[PDB]
């Protein structure tokens, strides 16, 4: 719905909405990585063929 | 009267280890820190380390750690200064001095309060 | 000690994991005496464990 | 060599006053009040002179004094005598647990 | 004058312990003003007296 006449000021660098999106995305990624295996035995040494 | 005494003038040859003995005469050897000071002949004083007789714990200066280690035997009132791998740069007089007062609390190990001095010994090597 | 009258703590040695799961290394760390319990039922003086 | 810097000689005549500058930094002189001065006659054992910035033992007169100033504390003599024409070495705690010396200050009295 | 030590324990975490004691060994304590405690413990007495 367009507003017929408005006096307004915008600033995009101080907007808090993007910081909220950042918080949401990282805090949701942390949730998404919870239910999966955390490896841990693979810190064992790897003996890898010395190809040239 | 309290006095600090030492083994007299010393003779060795370079490379040999030396064992300078210090006698605590006329006071409690258990109650005061003892400090060792080097004096190259006619030169300024260099600091070696201390020893706690009642505890037996010691600390040698970083310039000599792993080369100098002091010990004592209260039954003979003797404090020792061990010094191995002797360079000829160790040409010097070695002193035995009475430091601060030992307490169960407090820490006077590092205080420069040397009250009395032993008569010393000039080590002969070249 | 000849009753040093100052608690000495106990200087202990044990094995710890290096940056690989499989290789091990000896370590040391001073611990206060009350947290360290002797292990053997016999009169052994050499071996100890944490109170937990 | 001394970590503490200090002069090697200041000369004159009896009755004067002196200032001899033993210098350190935050780690030895700045952070702590453990500073001392030692008399060293030619060929003699050292004699404790000033202890803990400025206090004096027995057998030591009010002809001598000293005081702290930041990272330099100095030996202030007064009423000079030719009998006291000795070397002088500052001394101070230096952190960890160590003791350090400085200088070669030969007093001279004509 | 205790000094911290860093002992690694598996991936991405460390165990902290006392590594060495600089200087000489001494005893920990608490100091309390003497006559103030004497006066305080008598002052508690003059109030505690009434129910005994
Ligand atoms: C919590 O609470 C704690 C308390 O529970 C508290 O602990 C206390 O901390 C303070 C630190 O702030 C400690 O203070 C120190 O105490 C030292 C001990 O002094 C007391 O005892 C001595 C014992 O004297 C022995 O030696 C004489 C010979 O000199 C003998 O004849 C005596 O019998 C006696 O016994 C020995 O010998 C017997 C022989 O038979 C033996 O049988 C026996 O077993 C012994 O071996 C007394 O002399 C002291 O009194 C004299 O000194 C005071 C202060 O000057 C005078 O006012 C007093 O009138 C006496 O004259 C005292 O009773 C102190 O020595 C020590 O003071 C020195 O060091 C401080 C820095 O620490 C300096 O600032 C100060 O100037 C002192 O320097 C002199 O001594 C040093 C050696 O230590 C010398 O190197 C120095 O050059 C100077 O020399 C003196 O002698 C020269 C000649 O030798 C002379 O020329 C000089 O001019 C000068 O006079 C310091 O005050 C205190 O001890 C702790 N308390 C306890 C119970 O341990 C703790 O801090 C609290 N903590 C907190 C967080 O609150
Ligand atoms: C209790 O225990 C702590 C340690 O756990 C002691 O603190 C140490 O004190 C020593 C004093 O000698 C420090 O070593 C000296 O460091 C100087 C430079 O400072 C370093 O440390 C500070 C603090 O992080 C930094 O800002 C700085 O950039 C350095 O990293 C050096 O200049 C000294 O060496 C020089 O002089 C000596 C002779 O004096 C020479 O032999 C050297 O070759 C060199 O020319 C010296 O190495 C040490 O850094 C301190 N450690 C810490 C962790 O602070 C306390 O002193 C001890 N006692 C008390 C009462 O607290
Ligand atoms: C507490 O106890 C632990 C052990 O229980 C002890 O740690 C060990 O200290 C020694 C001495 O510093 C370490 O070994 C040294 O390693 C250096 C490496 O450069 C060597 O140069 C040393 O060689 C000399 O000293 C040996 C005797 O220690 C001589 O046999 C040798 O011929 C050389 O003269 C020395 O080997 C050792 O690595 C540690 N061990 C561990 C697990 O860290 C610690 O010092 C004790 N601390 C206290 C306060 O008691």
């Amino acid at each position: 719905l367009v507003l017929g006449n408005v006096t307004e000021n915008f600033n995009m660098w101080k907007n808090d909405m993007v910081d909220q999106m950042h918080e949401d995305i990282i805090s949701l990624w942390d949730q998404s990585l919870k239910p999966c295996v955390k490896l841990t035995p693979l810190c064992v040494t790897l003996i890898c063929s010395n190809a040239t | 009267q309290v006095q600090l005494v030492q083994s007299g003038a010393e003779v060795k040859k370079p490379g040999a280890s030396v064992k300078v003995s210090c006698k605590a005469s006329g006071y409690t050897f258990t109650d005061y820190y003892i400090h060792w000071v080097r004096q190259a002949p006619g030169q300024g004083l260099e600091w070696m380390g201390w020893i706690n007789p009642n505890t037996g714990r010691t600390n040698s200066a970083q310039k000599f750690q792993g080369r100098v280690t002091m010990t004592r035997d209260t039954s003979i009132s003797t404090a020792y200064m061990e010094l191995s791998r002797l360079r000829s740069d160790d040409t010097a007089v070695y002193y035995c001095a009475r430091g601060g007062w030992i307490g169960l609390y407090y820490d006077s190990s590092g205080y420069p309060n040397f009250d009395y001095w032993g008569q010393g010994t000039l080590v002969t090597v070249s | 000690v000849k009753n040093g009258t100052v608690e000495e703590m106990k200087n202990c040695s044990f094995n710890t994991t290096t940056e690989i799961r499989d290789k091990e290394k000896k370590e040391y760390a001073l611990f206060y005496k009350p947290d360290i319990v002797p292990l053997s039922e016999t009169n052994n003086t050499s071996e100890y464990r944490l109170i937990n | 060599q001394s970590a503490l810097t200090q002069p090697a000689s200041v000369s004159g005549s009896p009755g004067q006053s002196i200032t001899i500058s033993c210098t350190g930094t935050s780690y030895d002189v700045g952070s702590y009040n453990l500073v001392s001065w030692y008399q060293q006659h030619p060929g003699k054992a050292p004699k404790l002179m000033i202890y803990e910035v400025s206090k004096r033992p027995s057998g030591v007169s009010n002809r001598f004094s000293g005081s702290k100033s930041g990272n330099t504390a100095s030996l202030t003599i007064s009423g000079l005598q030719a009998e006291d024409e000795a070397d002088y070495y500052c001394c101070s705690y230096a952190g960890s647990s160590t003791v350090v010396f400085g200088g070669g200050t030969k007093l001279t009295v004509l | 004058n205790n000094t911290r030590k860093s002992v690694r324990i598996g991936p991405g975490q460390t165990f902290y312990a006392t590594g060495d004691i600089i200087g000489d060994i001494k005893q920990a304590h608490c100091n309390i003003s003497e006559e103030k405690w004497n006066d305080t413990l008598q002052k508690v007495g003059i109030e505690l007296q009434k129910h005994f």
Side-chain angles (χ1 to χ4, degrees):
Chain A
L1 179 59
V2 65
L3 281 82
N5 184 4
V6 176
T7 309
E8 181 60 47
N9 293 297
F10 271 73
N11 177 283
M12 62 175 257
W13 310 96
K14 305 297 179 73
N15 197 342
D16 64 299
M17 211 185 328
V18 301
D19 302 284
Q20 191 171 129
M21 204 180 159
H22 169 274
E23 292 291 328
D24 291 331
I25 275 172
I26 296 89
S27 283
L28 186 137
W29 205 260
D30 189 358
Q31 173 74 350
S32 76
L33 290 178
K34 278 285 290 186
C36 299
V37 62
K38 52 169 64 176
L39 300 183
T40 300
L42 304 183
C43 293
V44 60
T45 42
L46 294 174
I47 296 177
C48 312
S49 178
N50 185 35
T52 53
Chain B
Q1 165 61 342
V2 55
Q3 183 66 41
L4 276 294
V5 191
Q6 280 174 244
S7 63
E10 189 66 21
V11 182
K12 309 281 275 183
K13 266 291 188 180
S17 58
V18 60
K19 188 68 68 74
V20 175
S21 53
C22 166
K23 173 85 191 51
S25 294
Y27 72 109
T28 49
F29 189 50
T30 54
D31 292 10
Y32 286 86
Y33 285 96
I34 298 97
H35 281 255
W36 291 91
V37 173
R38 181 174 79 189
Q39 175 153 50
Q43 316 309 320
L45 307 178
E46 199 83 65
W47 182 76
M48 278 282 182
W50 72 86
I51 179 158
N52 193 329
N54 203 326
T55 313
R57 189 165 161 107
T58 54
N59 198 340
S60 303
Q62 69 277 18
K63 292 156 36 56
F64 318 101
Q65 165 57 5
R67 193 178 101 230
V68 172
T69 300
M70 291 65 58
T71 48
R72 81 298 184 273
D73 188 355
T74 61
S75 71
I76 49 165
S77 310
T78 299
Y80 300 83
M81 183 177 176
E82 201 276 327
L83 169 71
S84 197
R85 292 188 296 286
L86 179 87
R87 307 171 57 82
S88 57
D89 302 332
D90 306 329
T91 298
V93 175
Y94 298 154
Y95 290 131
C96 182
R98 182 180 78 160
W101 185 77
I102 289 160
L104 302 174
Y105 296 101
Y106 177 56
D107 193 356
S108 78
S109 55
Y111 283 33
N113 290 319
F114 311 141
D115 207 61
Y116 294 145
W117 302 80
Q119 93 295 1
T121 177
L122 179 51
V123 187
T124 297
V125 295
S126 181
Chain C
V1 189
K2 299 291 187 75
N3 196 4
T5 318
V6 169
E7 196 150 296
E8 303 293 345
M9 294 177 71
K10 258 178 165 57
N11 173 13
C12 295
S13 66
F14 61 108
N15 299 297
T16 61
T17 315
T18 195
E19 56 259 60
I20 308 97
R21 193 202 88 202
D22 79 9
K23 278 176 182 68
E24 190 70 26
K25 64 178 286 186
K26 197 186 286 187
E27 271 276 0
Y28 83 109
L30 288 95
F31 293 134
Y32 289 111
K33 183 56 200 322
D35 291 331
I36 305 300
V37 176
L39 179 54
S40 61
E41 64 272 19
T42 63
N43 197 28
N44 201 343
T45 64
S46 186
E47 191 167 55
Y48 282 99
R49 35 149 287 189
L50 279 84
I51 200 149
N52 83 77
Chain D
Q1 164 61 346
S2 303
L4 293 162
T5 311
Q6 172 199 330
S9 179
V10 181
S11 306
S13 74
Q16 303 170 192
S17 182
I18 278 154
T19 310
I20 291 146
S21 52
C22 183
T23 312
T25 181
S26 72
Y27 303 114
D28 51 1
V29 178
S31 300
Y32 299 105
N33 72 301
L34 296 170
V35 161
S36 296
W37 290 88
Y38 288 82
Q39 177 183 83
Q40 164 65 94
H41 280 283
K44 310 301 188 177
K47 184 90 186 46
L48 178 65
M49 187 66 204
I50 310 294
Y51 75 79
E52 295 177 31
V53 171
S54 67
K55 282 159 191 161
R56 280 182 262 87
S58 187
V60 160
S61 58
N62 56 287
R63 302 192 299 273
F64 299 80
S65 63
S67 51
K68 174 181 178 197
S69 45
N71 299 348
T72 186
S74 58
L75 168 59
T76 299
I77 298 169
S78 175
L80 261 66
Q81 300 285 260
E83 283 73 12
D84 299 346
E85 193 179 9
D87 297 331
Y88 287 90
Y89 296 77
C90 74
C91 182
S92 80
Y93 188 70
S96 182
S97 177
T98 61
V99 175
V100 182
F101 282 87
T105 306
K106 170 61 172 185
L107 185 65
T108 293
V109 176
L110 304 177
Chain E
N1 191 356
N2 306 145
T3 57
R4 185 186 299 258
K5 197 191 203 292
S6 296
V7 174
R8 288 197 68 77
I9 303 296
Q13 64 206 359
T14 47
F15 164 66
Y16 300 112
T18 304
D20 196 3
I21 300 190
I22 306 300
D24 200 7
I25 201 80
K26 296 288 160 263
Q27 173 62 54
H29 59 272
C30 291
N31 278 351
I32 295 163
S33 184
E34 190 173 331
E35 85 286 349
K36 296 290 104 177
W37 179 257
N38 191 28
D39 168 51
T40 294
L41 196 55
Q42 287 186 346
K43 277 177 174 156
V44 175
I46 61 166
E47 302 301 333
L48 185 142
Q49 172 182 8
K50 311 301 163 65
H51 314 273
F52 303 87

